[PDB]
């Protein structure tokens, strides 16, 4: 049903300055055999970033044959290896650097993209859900709620079953969620399968760059404290939630303890998580959980412990009763 433990598989969105770019040089899809390792580890849900400009080089027009076919291939391999996939439009509420809702990118063009994504892949067994837009921020924040409704309407023309994952303003910050999220209360899903998805990192600025270590004033509950504003908003408003991104470096055991406390809190509240990140071409990336010679991935052992716990019947938090 709904797996509480999942991973991001990043690479198809890399090198945004090269459009269309070349597969194998600027961007990377999973090679053959890739999902076998993760299925063997007991991870069965993947969030998969995609670049809007590569999927649709022209607004309101057919999806790109080559790039969309690489998505086809990836979903085929996920199905072969018992993996369910959340497709993520990894675009910050922008197309070619212009905000959805401006003159150059009308909401109707965003609706068109989501229609074409759902039309092409709603019949694919490996597709689990649609994360309609990664991290709206900045000048896109005010227009994002209107764009979100258009994206919902686009998907629902072709897929009236699967969950829709709706991110929030300000990089979908979990910690700042209640500051801005009341504007999302007007969103409507006729299929009643809408889930809000927030992001959290536990470095000082919560950006995930980890410019410093935990420090002397480290609190093991830092992750819990940063998702509480989000989860409490969900409870107050009877909404369902999800954590689309969280990751830590592999070089300090204190980060692992905070990750453990966060996973325990999310488990108690039936909130799934997608670790950021695995992927076929991360190299030395400090948050990567992809196997690499000479690198230990203690985050994976922790995820595996939680992946064996019972899933919940649906996205939490549970309704008050």
Residue numbers in the entry: 1 to 321
Q: What is written in the article reporting this PDB entry?
A:
RBcel1, an endoglucanase of the GH5_5 subfamily isolated from an uncultured bacterium, has aroused interest because of its ability to polymerize cellooligosaccharides in vitro under near-physiological conditions. After the glycosylation step, the donor sugar is covalently bound to the enzyme within its negatively numbered subsites. Transglycosylation occurs when a sugar hydroxyl group is used as an acceptor instead of a water molecule during the deglycosylation step. Solving the structures of two RBcel1 variants, RBcel1_E135Q and RBcel1_Y201F, in complex with ligands has brought to light some of the molecular factors behind transglycosylation.
